[PDB]
Design a protein around this ligand. Structure first.
Ligand code: PLR
Ligand code: PLR
Ligand code: HOZ
Lengths: 427, 402
């Protein structure tokens, strides 16, 4: 297994960029160091600058639900750019994508496009406070909503993987407004309200956690949060940047039947280009400028290229059988992995919902971020390297969920299992 | 002058999106409230959904310095997407654009790409505080750095050293640093007075504080190395955007090596992005920077923009309208006031009522200008000698009827 070309690129990259990457998540530090540099991607595969081919389960971290370089998305982009990539003025495509989002997500009646998930979470945070007139926010330990100052408190994703503390450079007076609590703990949430009458703007969370391993909500947890937020006139916000259009066309809120007041979107809406969005109850969105007093702008927001990519991606997802195929092949992958740990003598546990899954090296079960930190990170590191050599590409972290796409085949799944068998037997 | 199709589209939009737009200024509230919807852009022109053609002086707010839909940029983008648009892992192209940026911007020794000028400003503010361990920051009235906000932000008037000195004297050992637009564009075109930039450089060094340049709009337009290269003052950290994205969503922040080392994964300060550094944005940036390094680029922009700026100010003379303006390279200004304009306060003395009418008039003559008095104008390498003459001819007709 040669990675000569990647080490060269990476070695030179560390002199030009912090840690040689554009995002900490691409580090590989907690998994043995030395990342592989990609040359190209297509359907369910990725290729090294060294020629190695892999069955990809990261999917550029979520966007590639239709598979990499889907031919209908690329053809639509070629035709579109002939007309220019950015106008800086209104265009017909913004109206089209807007309607599609409103019909798809239950809580969204009015939307606003931005360029990333971080931009979407920052804006919804500022709108939560502006609408209720309150300053405090409640977030769960292990969840991640981009890097806006108030959110850098007990965050998951890279921070967890890298074992970092609440980031420095952010004034203690701003983080004082951020209240935390364990995931799946309704009682802890009631206490917070009890001790802070008239101060909580609302609650923000990942309807189904993906940034501290794959975690599903306990029975009654989402319904419970919806109940107590109504009691105290607080807002319930769903960050579906990762789950939107993946767990279901209308996201987790559609699948589990609970409707929030505001929800965020990203990744898949961009079909591969930089895009984000936030929308919800009309009476709330009315406060956004130029309709209202809360200012929020963006130069490239709503450019024709990105709109074109989002439109085409949602049309493909609307075809019948889409979400059923995703559940079918992902369940077979999840169950298989669990059966194999069992036979080789390894404690493990996991699960899947649609095309999202998780696999921990601990017997658990896993109900929160604390249970997850009990996984054998030493074993996971060896497991990850072994898979990489057998030609399977997994997220370089025990705290990241994995993904499948419409381009993954029954054969690709079987090949992944055969590879898991070989690796685990030698652990 | 028919705008039937635009009015219909914009009307349906207000029921789907806040105020019917993705960004405030696009709604035309400062000049009537009736925006025109674009269908396509090319070279120096733009086209209506009604078939109308305009000579564009907005250039999608900065990025289109090489002209709309440059054939060599579009061609490179077509070849690159056959390999995929996003990887989620390192790619060789990140190294390329990164080196080009380090070699072009004086103060940049190490860089991190992001997805907008806004993400860059968020990151740079947090990095300023983490490096010094202080919480106070100074910005100027009339300058824009995204919405990164909070009594930890002190403001002062642009072009006023004294007010800055005072702020340090009242908050000893609490100021992390100062951030500003080396040349203002987000509240009209405003150049810095003699010794103002030098003043700030020296005053920040005395207190072990940082100096930060937000060159999202000036970088690569005023000069290849931005304002810091043309005027000779070197900051500690700088933000970039617009042009390095060549038309796609891109941003960046860099500076001295030792300061950038705090950015994860190399350091404790956290900042990330799923789409950061994708091969499509990098390809657009590389090719845009290559076209700018061609001979006579910035000379040409100054040549045609001086004719335009001077002509305009002269036309206002003949027709009897108080006015003042100016230009540096391919960036110009023009206010309906005798001026001069040294800060945000002087700029507000403009006769908005007159600007609104002047705007519609030019729009009808086939000239598209920023829908606001507090926005700078732009020219590109695609604007020709004739395009400039036709614009001056149109301004004569409009100002002779105000
Ligand atoms: C749930 C969730 N919200 C927000 C973000 C940040 O979005 P982006 O990386 O596009 O800024 C991520 C990565 C995420 O997984
Ligand atoms: C000086 C300046 N700073 C920041 C920004 C924000 O960049 P963007 O709109 O890409 O977020 C702009 C547009 C700008 O001109
Ligand atoms: N770790 C969470 C992923 N969705 C991506 C993070 C990133 O690269 O910014």
């Amino acid at each position: 297994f040669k990675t000569i070309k990647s080490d060269e690129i990476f070695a030179a990259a560390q002199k030009l960029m912090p840690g040689g990457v554009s995002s900490p998540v691409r580090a590989f530090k907690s998994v043995g160091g030395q990342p592989i540099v990609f040359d190209r991607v297509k359907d369910a595969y990725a290729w090294d600058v060294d020629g190695n081919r892999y069955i990809d389960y990261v999917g550029t971290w979520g966007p590639a639900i239709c598979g990499h370089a889907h031919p209908e998305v690329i053809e639509a982009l070629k035709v579109a750019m002939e007309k220019g990539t950015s106008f800086g003025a209104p265009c017909a495509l913004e109206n089209v994508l807007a309607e599609m989002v409103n019909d798809a997500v239950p809580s969204i009646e009015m939307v606003r496009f931005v360029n990333s998930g971080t931009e979407a979470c920052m804006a919804v945070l500022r709108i939560m406070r502006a609408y209720t007139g309150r300053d405090k926010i409640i977030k769960f330990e292990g969840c991640y909503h981009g890097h806006a100052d108030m959110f850098l408190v007990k965050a998951g994703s890279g921070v967890a993987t890298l074992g970092l503390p609440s980031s420095p450079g952010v004034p203690k007076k701003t983080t004082a407004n951020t209240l935390t609590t364990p995931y799946n703990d309704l009682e802890a949430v009631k206490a917070l309200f009890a001790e802070n009458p008239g101060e909580i703007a609302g609650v923000i969370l990942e309807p189904i956690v993906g940034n501290s391993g794959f975690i599903v909500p306990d029975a009654g947890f989402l319904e419970g949060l919806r109940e107590i937020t109504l009691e105290h006139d607080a807002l319930l916000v769903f960050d579906e940047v990762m789950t939107g259009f993946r767990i279901a066309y209308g996201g987790v809120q559609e699948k589990f039947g609970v409707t929030p007041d505001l929800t965020t979107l990203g990744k898949i809406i961009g079909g591969g280009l930089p895009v984000g969005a936030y929308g919800g109850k009309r009476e709330i969105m009315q406060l956004v400028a130029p309709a209202g007093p809360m200012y929020q702008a963006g130069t490239l927001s709503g450019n024709p290229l990105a709109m074109t990519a989002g439109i085409k991606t949602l049309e493909l997802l609307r075809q019948p059988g889409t979400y059923e195929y995703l559940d079918q092949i992902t369940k077979r992958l999840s169950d298989g992995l669990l059966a194999i740990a069992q036979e080789t003598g390894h404690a493990a546990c996991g699960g899947q919902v649609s095309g999202m899954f998780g696999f921990f090296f601990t017997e658990g079960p896993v109900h929160n971020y604390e249970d997850a930190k009990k996984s054998d990170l030493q074993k996971f590191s060896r497991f990850h390297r072994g898979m990489l050599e057998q030609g399977i590409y997994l997220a370089p972290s025990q705290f990241e969920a994995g993904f499948t796409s419409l381009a993954h085949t029954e054969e690709d799944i079987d090949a992944t299992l055969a590879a898991a068998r070989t690796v685990m037997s030698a652990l």
